Enzyme design. Sequence first.
Site, PDB file in Angstrom:
ATOM      1  N   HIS A 319       0.857  -1.177   0.000  1.00 42.11           N
ATOM      2  CA  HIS A 319       0.000   0.000   0.000  1.00 42.11           C
ATOM      3  C   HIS A 319       0.894   1.228   0.000  1.00 42.11           C
ATOM      4  CE1 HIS A 319      -3.935   1.988   0.578  1.00 42.11           C
ATOM      5  NE2 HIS A 319      -3.215   2.911   1.187  1.00 42.11           N
ATOM      6  N   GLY A 320       0.789   2.032  -1.056  1.00 42.94           N
ATOM      7  CA  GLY A 320       1.607   3.216  -1.221  1.00 42.94           C
ATOM      8  C   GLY A 320       0.787   4.485  -1.104  1.00 42.94           C
ATOM      9  N   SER A 321       1.451   5.564  -0.702  1.00 44.03           N
ATOM     10  CA  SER A 321       0.844   6.881  -0.572  1.00 44.03           C
ATOM     11  C   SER A 321       1.972   7.885  -0.390  1.00 44.03           C
ATOM     12  CB  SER A 321      -0.157   6.956   0.585  1.00 44.03           C
ATOM     13  OG  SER A 321       0.425   6.579   1.813  1.00 44.03           O
ATOM     14  N   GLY A 328      -1.158   9.988   9.142  1.00 44.26           N
ATOM     15  CA  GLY A 328      -2.521   9.655   9.504  1.00 44.26           C
ATOM     16  C   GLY A 328      -2.726   8.159   9.631  1.00 44.26           C
ATOM     17  N   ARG A 335      -8.902   3.165   6.143  1.00 42.76           N
ATOM     18  CA  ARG A 335     -10.347   3.315   6.221  1.00 42.76           C
ATOM     19  C   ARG A 335     -10.987   3.009   4.878  1.00 42.76           C
ATOM     20  NH1 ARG A 335      -8.432   5.691  10.022  1.00 42.76           N
ATOM     21  NH2 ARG A 335      -6.917   6.925   8.821  1.00 42.76           N
ATOM     22  N   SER A 361       1.560  -0.583  -6.688  1.00 38.36           N
ATOM     23  CA  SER A 361       1.240   0.251  -5.535  1.00 38.36           C
ATOM     24  C   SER A 361       2.221   1.407  -5.396  1.00 38.36           C
ATOM     25  CB  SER A 361       1.223  -0.586  -4.258  1.00 38.36           C
ATOM     26  OG  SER A 361       0.107  -1.453  -4.222  1.00 38.36           O
ATOM     27  N   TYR A 364       1.774   5.027  -6.442  1.00 41.40           N
ATOM     28  CA  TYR A 364       0.943   5.941  -5.677  1.00 41.40           C
ATOM     29  C   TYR A 364       1.747   6.733  -4.658  1.00 41.40           C
ATOM     30  CZ  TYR A 364      -2.901   2.949  -7.376  1.00 41.40           C
ATOM     31  OH  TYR A 364      -3.784   2.244  -8.159  1.00 41.40           O
ATOM     32  N   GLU A 449      -5.467  -7.063  -8.840  1.00 41.56           N
ATOM     33  CA  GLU A 449      -5.411  -6.339  -7.579  1.00 41.56           C
ATOM     34  C   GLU A 449      -6.429  -6.937  -6.626  1.00 41.56           C
ATOM     35  OE1 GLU A 449      -5.439  -2.155  -8.171  1.00 41.56           O
ATOM     36  OE2 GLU A 449      -4.584  -1.706  -6.201  1.00 41.56           O
TER      37      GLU A 449
END
Lengths: 474, 114, 306
Positions: A319-321, A328, A335, A361, A364, A449
Amino acid sequence: GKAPVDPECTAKVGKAHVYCEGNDVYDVMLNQTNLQFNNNKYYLIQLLEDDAQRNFSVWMRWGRVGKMGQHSLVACSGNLNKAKEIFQKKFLDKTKNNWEDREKFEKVPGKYDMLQMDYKPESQLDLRVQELIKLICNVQAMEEMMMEMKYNTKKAPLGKLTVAQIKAGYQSLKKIEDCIRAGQHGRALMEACNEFYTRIPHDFGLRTPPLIRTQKELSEKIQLLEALGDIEIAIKLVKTELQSPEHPLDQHYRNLHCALRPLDHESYEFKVISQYLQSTHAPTHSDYTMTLLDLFEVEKDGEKEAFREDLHNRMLLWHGSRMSNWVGILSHGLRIAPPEAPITGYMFGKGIYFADMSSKSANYCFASRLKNTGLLLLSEVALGQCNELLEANPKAEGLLQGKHSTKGLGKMAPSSAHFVTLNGSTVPLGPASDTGILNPDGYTLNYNEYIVYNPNQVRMRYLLKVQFNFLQLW
Amino acid sequence: APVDPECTAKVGKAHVYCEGNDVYDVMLNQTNLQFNNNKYYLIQLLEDDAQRNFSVWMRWGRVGKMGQHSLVACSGNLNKAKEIFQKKFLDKTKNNWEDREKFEKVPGKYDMLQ
Amino acid sequence: SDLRKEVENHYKLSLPEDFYHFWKFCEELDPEKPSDSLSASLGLQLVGPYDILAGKHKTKGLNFNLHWRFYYDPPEFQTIIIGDNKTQYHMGYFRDSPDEFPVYVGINEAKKNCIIVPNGDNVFAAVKLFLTKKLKEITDKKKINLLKNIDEKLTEAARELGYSLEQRTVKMKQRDKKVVTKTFHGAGLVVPVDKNDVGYRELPETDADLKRICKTIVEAASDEERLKAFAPIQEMMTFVQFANDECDYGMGLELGMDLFCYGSHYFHKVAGQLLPLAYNLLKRNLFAEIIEEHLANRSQENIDQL
């Protein structure tokens, strides 16, 4: 909260304050748009009293949102009553709502609508976690990113928004979704688009604001609103603290409320994670490489009790961001999308999204040549029985019927023969190879995915510190 | 050529700057009954006493009525103020400020008060 | 036909029948030098595959992806006729994919701009349009009779072969409905689009703002200033990665093309990361070969027989 004065009033930015009385802060921003007649305009109003001398003023400034405009400063020599009267009168004229009872606001057609704004050191921690927290807790960088969210990519020109303002925006996107679902491009659609562009300020230059006609623009708007919410939560989390911290980041770390422990480069876990990172770099994302600089162990409170340990098919997924919003997640976990958010933006529904190929991922993260540091998070996700999807269908969630997750069947993907194990979780090593799934009716998804719905099915386990290394540019 | 009393935000506390011929205070009028134009435009440079700290006042509208006005502050440097003033005069009249003496009324542009 | 297969084997492309029929037409006009049969009259030259038709390739390393490939000829574009070498005016067949016939004949002035202007759907149309336009450009009357005769031969040949002579035919107007975006070259992209609109999505930037981005980047005064200014290209490339992952390949196809049109060497690598891959994702591997070879060797003189 902290009430800032508009800096643009140079004659009063340092000698004056916005007026407040309990709830009622005499500051307001109005927006109007009507693509039928191509109006897209704002109007800010602020009552300022000087700090030093007893003198009140009304500041008004108006123009196309994004493009600074005509301003007026009306001084009153301390005639607070007249000035408040003028303020309320103009507010009514422009809104058709009385100012004092701003709580019960009702917008009317062909008039401005309101909006809502936000206006002895022993620093004991591992040095690596210290670098991590300082990286993610850098308030300067958060401010700079917010300023870029107004003057680089004009998504929020005038300023920030509130959680509830975002919720109202989502309500308008829901109305847009309902409208578009029937393919009718007449008057109601134009009014609904007007409502959308009123609630969320955009800058179209002069070209008539276009109608929202396809699903792609819906989903883009949804992602924009999500980024707005992300910035809101990031600034809420980065609130500084007193009380003898000797390293305020230690209190920020408590606010993370998530143990993050440094791992040695020679540990089995570190090497295997590096193997997983490298082996699963998709070949079609070759404009850059990635190096694993450091790896941190994750222990988020409360997640252990929630994990669906009973469910089979447990795997570690990416999971990338962006570097900034991770603060957060580590405090609150992942969420599901906002319920009020339109379902039709997610071609396979809401929930939590994971990949097993690092680069997909990793796309992102939006790391950069100048800013070469990004993070990828690995989580253990109990997918259970997957529902198989060949073609986009936003209604996948109804089709579960006993299953616990959805799989979108991509052309390229690892095969279970190469899978290994880490602490009893399945680690899906690459390389990607052809999976023999194909479509003799439509398109074929490029890559698999996996999506889960129950938030309790995710357990974050390691956080990866990654140097994205870009290459020659010409 | 008096400072406008209607500039309440600036009356009392400053003295308008001029230099001989070049008077950086002026009122212009344009009447044109074909198009029912009848509008005026005052411009005034004001200096602070303490520091070299200047302001440009513009005021315009239909004759008699205050209409609208703008304050562009030039605490930075008086030369900026001359730039704004002279450039705006050219924009609005098609006549340069240095050559203001030889004014020729071009159609649809301001003339001043003799 | 027996001299066709060697032509199309050399280019790895199929050529339409009007090409060969026009070869026979020019042969009949001037057996000695059919390719240049219009050179004395019009100042235009038959080149490219006509070079193979002329057997002029028999003097000889031979890279036909670059043969008369002008600086701004996109890989879709196969130069077939040359005019003013001062402006590098030229006409070429336009193919969207190596397995399809050309959709029309376009013209470009590589020393003037990057715009490819439609000029009919076949070489008869292209040459007639150029001829008619020049007929008014020519400041004389005595030296026109030859053009009237050659034009008469053009018209009779086109009528006999059943070719329309319009600048924009029916098939072109049909393709234009399939044209999803102009992409700074104005010729349009054709990408696969399924019933769920999967296959393409628009860029996060407008075309005018894209040109502005290119201007501000290319004009940066230092490499550090460029790297700081490079942020929008990196962002757009990340979103391009996102789109390709979801099978909207044409977006990555389009962005590189605009940089290809912009022409700066500072963009040779990034386009080489975007445009070949997009062609690979689209199964247009030959275009990936062409763009690789052109970006590695993009010259202002491109006649492989020199």
